[PDB]
Amino acid sequence: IITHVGGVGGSIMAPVAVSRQLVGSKPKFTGRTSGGVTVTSHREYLTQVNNSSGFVVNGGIVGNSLQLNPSNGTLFSWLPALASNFDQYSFNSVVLDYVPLCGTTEVGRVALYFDKDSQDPEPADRVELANFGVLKETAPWAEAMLRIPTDKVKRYCNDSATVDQKLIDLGQLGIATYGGAGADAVGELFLARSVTLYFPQPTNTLLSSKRLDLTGSLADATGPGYLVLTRTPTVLTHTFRATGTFNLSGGLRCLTSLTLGATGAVVINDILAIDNVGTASDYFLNCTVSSLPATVTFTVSGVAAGILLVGRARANVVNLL
């Protein structure tokens, strides 16, 4: 069949393009009849690796997100709400898969790694990425793999909250691109799953609570974490980590009518915007992200207390009549 030319048995072919074909990953639960507790193995997708001539990591996004715990609503788009009737998690297999949309003529580097410290900070440069134990180094166009070192320790989910994210999380996951020529798309990576659900509980809420200090930095958290809400002395920051349709509820301290800006992949849905000028205010809004960078920001003055809540929601109303 195939006739390929200029080839004598034992020779190399670098083709114009390559592609694998990906299908319906329909999960299987297994009954580990135990404490009458469950086990799940399904395939959840994870992000579209775009290029970075320069040197970027999960989107140039920072605050080890990525985090291998399930939920990571940030990471795992389906497991979201099962390990949600449960309290202890434990994997058996997790494998990074890297397919490629681009073609044998893009010019760059992608790279998947694994840090056992859910908390150490991120890759600085070339020489650092490469020193990791569990790493892989691929041109972008060519097809790649990574399998992850799983213990069987009895590890806890984030339902109550826990600052030592390391003693509870399994690992960190990296994806890193340098040496590109443009920050376009070349890769879409997947997630090979297998998890052991344990002491199943009243089901935890997935709702987000995020306080800015009055002049300050940061008050409480509950998370998960889709959002960070910073202030700058005038003006807020609502910096997305998550994608989809959300629902936003809250307001803040200002005095000064709200001007609703945002930036990147964004589909505003319902912006409602009470103020009282002199005092504080409220915002409900409903938006829908499908990118990074998605940003939004409220524009205001004298941002002297920041409060919000975020808890994923449909094309759902959020405005008066």
SS3 212: strand
DSSP 8: -
Task: Quote the tokens at residue 190.
Answer: 């997947």
The site partner of 228 among its own copies, Ca ion, none (C-beta below 5 to 8 Å per kind) is: none
Measuring CA to CA, which residue among 168, 189, 76 is closest to residue 116? 168
Task: Quote the tokens at residue 310.
Answer: 């975020």
Q: Which is nearer to its own copies, 17 or 35 (CB)?
A: 17
Residue 279 CB, nearest distance to its own copies (Å)?
Answer: 8
Per CB under 8 A, contacts with its own copies among 202-261 are: 202-203, 205-207, 209, 211-214, 219-220, 222, 243-245, 247, 249-253
The site partner of 272 among Ca ion, its own copies, none (C-beta below 5 to 8 Å per kind) is: its own copies
For every residue of 99-151, which 3-state class applies, written as one string?
Answer: ECCCCCCCCCCEEEECCCCCCCCCCCCHHHHCCCCCCEEECCCCCEEEECCCC
Q: Residues 29, 30, 34, 120: which binds Ca ion (CB under 5 A)? A: 120
Per CB under 8 A, contacts with its own copies among 12-41 are: 12-26, 36-41
The site partner of 152 among its own copies, Ca ion, none (C-beta below 5 to 8 Å per kind) is: none
Return the range that interacts with its own copies (CB under 8 A); candidates 176-184, 230-238, 295-303: 176-184
Q: Residues 117, 137, 151, 213: which binds Ca ion (CB under 5 A)? A: 117
Measuring CA to CA, which residue among 246, 237, 283, 284 is closest to residue 267? 246
DSSP conformation letters of 21-51: -------EEE---TTS--EEE-EEEEEEEE-
Q: What is the per-residue binding string for Ca ion in 159-198, x denoting contact by CB under 5 A? A: x---------------------------------------
Residue 33 CB, nearest distance to its own copies (Å)?
Answer: 26
Q: Which is nearer to Ca ion, 176 or 254 (CB)?
A: 176
Site membership for its own copies, residue 133 (CB under 8 A): yes
On whether the CB atoms of residues 141 and 102 are closer than 8 A, the answer is: yes
DSSP 181: S
Residue 224 CB, nearest distance to its own copies (Å)?
Answer: 12
Site membership for Ca ion, residue 115 (CB under 5 A): yes
The site partner of 46 among its own copies, Ca ion, none (C-beta below 5 to 8 Å per kind) is: its own copies
Per CB under 8 A, contacts with its own copies among 95-124 are: 99-109, 113, 115-121, 124
* Element holding 155 (H helix, E strand): strand 155-156
Note the Cα 71 to chain centre separation in Å: 10
